[PDB]
Structure formats: C-alpha cells, structure tokens
Amino acid sequence: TFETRIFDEPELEFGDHHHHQDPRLGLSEAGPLQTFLGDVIKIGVVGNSKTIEDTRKFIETVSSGVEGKGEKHPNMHPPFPGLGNQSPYRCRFEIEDGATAALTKSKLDKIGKEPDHYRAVEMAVDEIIGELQAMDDGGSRPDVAIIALPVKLLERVWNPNFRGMLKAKAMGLSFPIQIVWEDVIDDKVTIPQKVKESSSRKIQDIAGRTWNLMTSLYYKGSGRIPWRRMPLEGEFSACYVGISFYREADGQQLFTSAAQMFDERGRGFVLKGRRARTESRGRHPYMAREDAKKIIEDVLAAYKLHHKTLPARVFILKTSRFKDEEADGIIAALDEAGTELRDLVWVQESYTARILRDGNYPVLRGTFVDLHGKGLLYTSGSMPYYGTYPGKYDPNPLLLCPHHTSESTVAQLAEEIFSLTKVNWNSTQMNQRLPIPIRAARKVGEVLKYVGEGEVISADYRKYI
Amino acid sequence: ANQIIGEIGENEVRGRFLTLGWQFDGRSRLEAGIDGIAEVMNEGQPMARMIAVQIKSTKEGKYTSESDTSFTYLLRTQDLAYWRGSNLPVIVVFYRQSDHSFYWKEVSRDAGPGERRLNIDKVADLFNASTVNKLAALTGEDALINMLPLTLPNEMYIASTTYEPRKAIAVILNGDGPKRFDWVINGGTFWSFHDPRTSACSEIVDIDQVEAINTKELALHDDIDEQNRFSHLLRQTLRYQTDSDLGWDKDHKALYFRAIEREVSRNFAYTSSKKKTDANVVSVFKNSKDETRVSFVRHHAFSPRFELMADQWYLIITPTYYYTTNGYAPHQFAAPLLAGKKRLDKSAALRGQVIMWHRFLTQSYLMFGEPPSIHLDVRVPEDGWVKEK
RNA sequence: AUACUGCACAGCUGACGA
DNA sequence: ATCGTCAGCTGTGCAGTA
Ligand SMILES: [Mg+2]
C-alpha cells in the first residue's frame, strides 16, 4: 500500500568539468560553465542623479569586500567573494561616464501632478525609452542598462502594471535592462507600502541581493550561461516544452504562452520563447487542435537547425490538463514527423492531501508517493545541506498526472521533473518548487500581454527574465 | 593591485624558506607554472637536492570550507598535467596576510589518474620548523496520510420519486422541522439511507408507493454527475450524523464546533490508549486588559472532501478555524486573525488535529476507518536542530 | 520591480435542474 | 433568467525567511 521513494538532490555542472549541488559554492570554486572572452562588462545607468551616484557607490563597495550575515547555517548564508582576483565570474564590471542618463527634476513633478492613471505611466515609460534609445543609437553603447527607480516616481507610478509596460517597449534595443528600486542599491531609505499604509516593506541582507543581482547582471551582460543540469550516461536526446495561460490586459479573454528548451551539441543549453503571438479563442484555459500542432512544429524545427537531426524524445509540461484535443494534436504532429517516444504530464498545485510524520520538522525534499497513476511529489521542505526547513507553515506538494498516452513510468517522470528545478537563472536559491519550463512560460506571458498589435516579439530569454 | 600582493606573498615565502635556511631562488618575468626552486642545505654543507614551489598568496577573506581545523582547495586540471610531468618534486604553499598564515601541501606525482580537491588541515600541515624532515623526506521511519477510508451500509433505497420541487419541501414546515434528509437532486429520484415510509413520509412530503432496494452499487458509477450526486449524499449524511454538535459554515465550507449553551470547550480529544483527553476546542479572548470586551473566539473546524479511488470512498480533511463574535453569532470580519494563527504553527501541531478529528468522527450511519501508514527509507536527521520549527 | 516560500480575498470557467 | 451541487484556473496583496 502506497510505496514511497526518496530521491537524491540533483547536481549541476559548472565550468572545468566540475559538478556540485549548490549554485553559490559551485560558482566560487570552478567559475561559470561558459567563460567570457574578455575582462570588462559595461553597465549603463538611467534615473536620478542620487540613484546614479549610489549605484556607482554600491558597485564599488560590492566589488571591494562585502561579507555574509551570520555564523549559524554557514552553508545557507555564504559570503560574497567580491569582483577582485578570485571573483566567481572571472571577469570585471565597469561603468563608463558616457552611458549615464539623468531624468530632470522639472519632469517628475509633471508626472506626479497628472490626475489620470494611464497617461502618467505612459509618459514616464516614454521618457525612459527615449533616453535608452538615444543612448543605444550613439557610440557609448553598454551591455546591460540599470533602471534605478527614484522614490518620487515610485509613489506616483506604483501607488496598469509598470514593469510589463516598460519591458514591452524596450524590446527593440540591443541590450537587456534591469529594474532596481532605491532600497537595494542605497540603504537608510524605506519605501512605504501599498494600501496597507505606514507599514513599508522588508528586504534581504546585503549578501543575498549581491549574489542574485550579480548573477543576473553577468547572465544579461555576457550572454553566456553560468550553470546547467548535468546529463546522465545513456539517456536519449530530448526536448522540453512548457505551456501556460494568461488573461487579457484589461478584459476577459485567455491566451496561451509557450517556451522551448533543449541541450547544445557541446557544453551549453538553449532556452527560448517564440516569435509570434498565439491569438485568442475564448475564456477557457485550454488550447485547440490547431494551436497545439504549431508549437510542436516549431520545437522540432528548432532542434534540427542545431543538431542536424530530429530528437528521440519530446517532453511536454502543462498546468490545465489534457482532455482530448490538445493531446490529439500533439500526438498527430509527433507521429507525423519522426518521433517514437513521448510524454504528456499535467502538474497541479491544488491537491488537499498531505503527509504527516512524527517530530517537528516536515518531510524531506524529494519524497515521492505513488497514488495509482498519480504522483505526490514534495519539491519543498527540510534540506540536510541547508540545515533547517526554509518556510513557515508546511510544504505544498505537487500532484503529477500523466496522460494515458505516455511511455515512462511515473517515478522516472518524477525524477526528471525534480531534476529540472535549480536551472532558474533569476535566483540562486535551492528551494524552488516549480520546474523550469512552466516558470519560463509564465515569465514570458507576464510581459507578452502588454505588447500592442503588430509590434515585435523577441525570442531571446534575456529580455523576459 | 593584485601584482603587489603576489610579490609580497612570494617575498614572504622566500623569507620563510631563508629563516631556517634552504637557499630559495626566484624566477624571471615570463615565469609560467613553477614559482621557485629550493635546495636542501642540511645545516651547512649544501647538497644538490631541488624541489619546485608554487605559491598561492591572498590578502583577506576566508577559504572555501574554513572550519577552524581544515579547509579544501580545487585544482584546475591544467596545473595537474603540468606538475605530473616534472622530474623533481612539487610543493604548493598557501600564504595569507591577514593572520600571517603559512601552509603547505604535496602534489601526488606517483598515482595514475590525478586527484583534485586537496584537503588542507591545520596544525599537521604548518610550514614551520616542526615539519622540515618530513618536507625533506622525499628529497526507515513511518508516517500517516491525511485520507480516511469509509465503509457504507449494505442497503439503500432508490425509488419513490417525489415529483415536488427541491426548495418547496425544504420551505414546507416538514422540511424545516425534524430530520432534513429530504434531498432530491435535479428533480431526480429520492434516494436515501432510510426508507420514506419510516423516515420521509412520516415527516416529509412524499408518496407511499414503493419499498426500494439497492446493494450500494450507486456508490460506483462511470458517470461523473451521479458520482457528484453520491458525494452530495455523503455530505448530507455527514451533516445528519452530527446534529446539535457542530454547525455548517457555508462561506468556508466547513464544520465548526458549537457552544452548547456554554461558550467554553468540551475537551473530548482522543483517548490514545494509556494517554489522556484534552483539547481546547472553543476559547474566548480579551483585549485592552479588560475581560468585558470580548474580542473573538477560536472554533475548530475542518473542510471535508469526498474522493473516489481504488473503488473506495476516501475523506480528505483540511483543518482550519472559525472566528465569531460573542458566541454563535458570526464575526463581521476576520481577515488577519486566521492568517496570524496559521503563521504561528508547526507540522507537529497539525498531525494531532487530524488524529483528534478522526477519533471524534468515529465511535462514541457511516463508519470511519483508520488512516493508512507509509514507510520512509531515509530518516530526517533531526539532531542538533531542536529549535525554530 | 535583487529573490524564494507561505497565507488571505476577489473574478472567471465547464457538467448537472427549476 | 438567477439560485444550489461537483472540480478547477488566473489575478492581487502581505509576511518572513533563522
Ligand atoms: Mg530578474
């Protein structure tokens, strides 16, 4: 009755043929998987003069000597080695004096005095994009821009989403951007919260923001990937697809979003979105028999352009079930092209059953329980490496339901999905719950909803993360 | 500015070599790999016995796994192939300026495939006068699941369709009187666990025309809608099984304990064989240092759900709380109270709730069994972390 | 919006009847 | 046409990582 399994923690592959399970420690003693050819990554700043000055101060202070938080749990709050001789990225970050743009004080008051909600956001986005385009068209081009948001603009704009509208109009530029509030770069300043007024917000310490921001900046600037999931020995070649759904901007419709992922010929990884919008079909979170084929055709066409041959396995992940039609279209395309092995899995974070054990701390991360054809997987909980349970109440398990047309058993699928959790380049944490393809699909659909009709869509992942 | 700390480290290593006296010698500008060549003097009368020295010097910071007794270092597999082809011994020397620390290690030049990850422990690997002749020597537990199995009565009656609308019978005084099992679904047949001649037609508008009989096959049917109707039957049977003991919270779909003419708890809990019985199910609270101003209450509750699996009907229990004002009169607002109560909790303070709800739910009509148990191979460490959660 | 986890509310979908 | 039963998805906001 209810046979259970416990999986080991997967290991990521870093540079120089080194593998570990901690992204922080594996970077600090082996470097990135792909090394940058060159020493300098150039950073541009756009915002207020105070924000530019404390951004420069923050960069210098972080580069010099910053250190961790506490003596308890040494494997959970590591110190930052700094951008010196023993930097984890083996490269240097510099800011040029010509790639810095300042917003005049005689315009933020114009933004703040408008009694309309949409127009102020629109013109602030217009000003920021105008300065960025003027910087890009010149000869002082940076590799990654930092948009530091002042508190005066933040009060008017945050209190229509701003991040989505800004990243939708910054798609034509040649460099990605990174939004930073005034709290992170400069201390002694606190931002008041939303409708729950006079409570403000709290952030991490100095040594976690540094790790996350520096990893994101390196990935956005260099273009190379820091780490990747270690392949096993003897597996078949496979490609991963992830599908999500998202509502309209203001109305009540539902579009679908997709992301694709596979492995390079040498030592690399490929993670992209698409180059087109998937239109509308109503208000149900379900695809059709025509929109399910085209994603499979694009996924199979992307693999042959790199490996010169079709893959032997296709892996599809979704949140809203495979009743009869999407599965029919996927199977039809898959048996039409070349492929013998297939997998269709529906994940849901809505089940009510849990597992209760004696003691104080909850169950271990990676525990798997088989309920007939369904799998209860705990990709959250206590970890021996960290030394505690990083949470408050209890882990929320995932329920895995494979479709009735699938090859692998549910244990191998659970192991594969458990392996694809620490490949999030936005964060350096070890307690991720969702697998990478659906997270990428949600991140793509977060900003794909604020792009107007007939505009451009980029397949680069650096413009969505 | 790293050139100056490299030069300082090389000079300090040469000085440490010259203090005991071994005739160390540096190299030129385009040196790559070996940083120096050292001799063995042996207290005057020097002998031509050279070793190669590679220097790693630092200024501040900590090593990778500095645990006050040892740390570790990783090699780059280019220096390994470089050092494994030499015709003379190789030595790596670590120097730190902040605490003036010197350590040394020997690269194994005698095995087959190389081995990285040097484990440098202190005391025993100090580059001082203590270790010089050695330097010159080479020249399952268990758990339970939240589900609860159920077993049903062997007979149930499917006949005597009422031909009356489902609301009219309820608003008839027969409906809002004694036993309210007058359940018909989508104007369908009146099927229930008790015969209408003794249960319904005695106290509910119905027709005396038939006796009915079923082997509980209705429990399992391929159609989803009839399964949902059976779930509605099970929910109403559970509601009938607990008359004048608990009440129904519709906005949260929960069963909350009632203050039976007194606004304190009942403390039924679970016997637990040799153990005792305490459970503060109902509790009141005050604020502003005055007991007259009653703030809220803490009714226990659980959300039930009926599921079909392995041709069995399992009950899923979700513990929660209900807050009212004064007593048996619902609160106008509990937005932060439930979240604050949930925030301060543990996994230990959730298994006991399930156990006590199970022990209350059966014994003192449908029987409720015992929850299944599973065996876990790898146990949680749980040692030395007796705090927090 | 440096990040991840946990919780609380509102809205919208299909299947079943007056 | 609105109201009951069943199960499920996406959107927004706050607290705390220990
Ligand atoms: Mg990011």
DSSP states of B44-110: SS-EEEEEEEEEEEE-SS--TT--SSEEEE---SSHHHHHTT-SS-EEEEEEETTTTEEEEEE---S
User: Are A233 and A434 in contact, with CB atoms under 8 Å apart?
Assistant: no
- Which of B58, B143, B343 is opposite residue A355, by nearest beta carbon? B143
Task: Report B:100-119 residues touching A (Cβ under 8 A).
Answer: none
Residue A160 (CA) to nucleotide C9 (C1'), in angstroms, measures 20
| A201/B316 Cα distance (integer angstroms) | 37
The Cβ of residue A254 has, within 10 Å, a number of other Cβ atoms equal to 16
Query: Closest chain A residue to B302 measured between Cα atoms?
Result: A352
Resolution in A: 3.2
Give the DSSP H or E segment for B375: strand B373-376
Query: Closest chain A residue to B378 measured between Cα atoms?
Result: A6
Give the DSSP H or E segment for B308: strand B299-309
Query: Closest chain B residue to A65 measured between Cα atoms?
Result: B61
Which tokens go with A23?
Answer: 């992204």
The Cβ of residue A151 has, within 10 Å, a number of other Cβ atoms equal to 17
| B359/B368 Cα distance (integer angstroms) | 9
CA of A210 to the centre of ligand 1 (A): 13
CA of A465 to the centre of ligand 1 (A): 5
Which tokens go with A26?
Answer: 């594996």
CB contact under 8 A, A359 and B143: no
- Which of A28, A384, A393 is opposite residue B345, by nearest beta carbon? A393
Query: Closest chain B residue to A3 measured between Cα atoms?
Result: B374
- Which of B144, B310, B389 is opposite residue A372, by nearest beta carbon? B310
CB contact under 8 A, B347 and A16: no
Q: What is the DSSP string of B309-373?
A: ETTEEEEEEEEEEE-BSSSSSB-S--SHHHHHHHHS--SHHHHHHHHHHHHHHS----EE-PPPE
CB contact under 8 A, B342 and A393: yes
* Contact residues on chain A for B77, CB-CB shorter than 8 A: 16-17
User: Are A165 and A172 in contact, with CB atoms under 8 Å apart?
Assistant: no
Q: Assess whether A307 (CB) lies less than 7 A from strand D.
A: no
CB contact under 8 A, A360 and B348: yes
- Which of B144, B380, B385 is opposite residue A356, by nearest beta carbon? B144
* Contact residues on chain B for A84, CB-CB shorter than 8 A: 2
- Which of B146, B376, B380 is opposite residue A353, by nearest beta carbon? B146
SS (H, E, C) chain A: CCCEEECCCCCEEECCCEEECCHHHHHHHHCCCCCCCCCEEEEEEEECHHHHHHHHHHHHHHHHHCCCCCCCCCCCCCCCCCCCCCCCCCCEEEEEEEEEEECCHHHHHHHHCCCCHHHHHHHHHHHHHHHHHHHHCCCCCCCEEEEEECHHHHHHHHCCCHHHHHHHHCCCCCCCEEEEEHHHHCCCCCCCCCCCCCCCCCCCCHHHHHHHHHHHHHHHHHCCCCCEECCCCCCCCCEEEEEEEEECCCCCCEEEEEEEEEECCCCCEEEECCCCCCCCCCCCCCCCCCHHHHHHHHHHHHHHHHHCCCCCEEEEEECCCCCCHHHHHHHHHHHHHCCCEEEEEEEECCCCCCEEECCCCCCECCEEEEECCEEEECCCCEECCCCECCCCCCCCCEEEEECCCCCCCHHHHHHHHHHCCCCCCCCCCCCCCCCHHHHHHHHHHHHHHHCCCCCCCCCCHHHCC
CA of B246 to the centre of ligand 1 (A): 49
Q: For residue A10, give every residue at least 6 positions away whose Cβ sits within 8 Å of its Cβ, in sequence order, or none.
A: A21, A229, A230, A418, A419, A421, A422
Full strand arrangement of the beta sheet holding A355-357: A355-357, B141-145, B373-376
Task: Report B:293-322 residues touching A (Cβ under 8 A).
Answer: 303, 305, 309-310, 316, 318
Tell me the β-bridge partners of A263. Answer: A269
SS3 B198: helix
Question: At B100, which amino acid appears?
Answer: H
- A291-307 helix and A325-337 helix, angle to the nearest 10 degrees: 30
Q: Which residues in window 329-388 of B are less than 7 A from strand D by Cβ?
A: 343, 388
Which nucleotide's C1' is closest to B166 (Cα)? C18
Which of A441, A422, A425, A427 lies closest to A272, judged by CA? A441
Q: Which bases in strand C are touched by protein, i.e. have an atom under 7 Å from a CB?
A: 1-9, 11-18
Which of B253, B250, B240 lies closest to B302, judged by CA? B253
| A419/A436 Cα distance (integer angstroms) | 10
Which nucleotide's C1' is closest to A167 (Cα)? C1
Q: Assess whether A194 (CB) lies less than 7 A from strand D.
A: yes
Q: Which bases in strand D are touched by protein, i.e. have an atom under 7 Å from a CB?
A: 4-18
| B192/B95 Cα distance (integer angstroms) | 85
Taking the CA of residue A40 and the nearest CA in chain B, the distance in Å comes to 17
Give the residue with minimal CA–C1' separation from D9. Answer: A285
| B57/A208 Cα distance (integer angstroms) | 27
Q: How was this structure determined?
A: cryo-EM
